[PDB]
């Protein structure tokens, strides 16, 4: 899931913030 | 574009923005 989006596309920190625990 | 040259950045991301939290990273 992380891969797809944060790798082709610059995810921000508020985006990223979706896979904390 | 390399998924696991790109997953060496990500977890360092994860990390930085996660903090104490943490997170699960399942490359799969
Ligand atoms: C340290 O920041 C990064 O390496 C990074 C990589 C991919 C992203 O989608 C976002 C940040
Ligand atoms: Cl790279
Ligand atoms: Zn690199």
Known sequence: ?21 | VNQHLCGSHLVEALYLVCGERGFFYTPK
């Open chain 1, 1 to 21: 899931g992380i891969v797809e989006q944060c790798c082709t596309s610059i995810c921000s920190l508020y985006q990223l913030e979706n896979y904390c625990n």
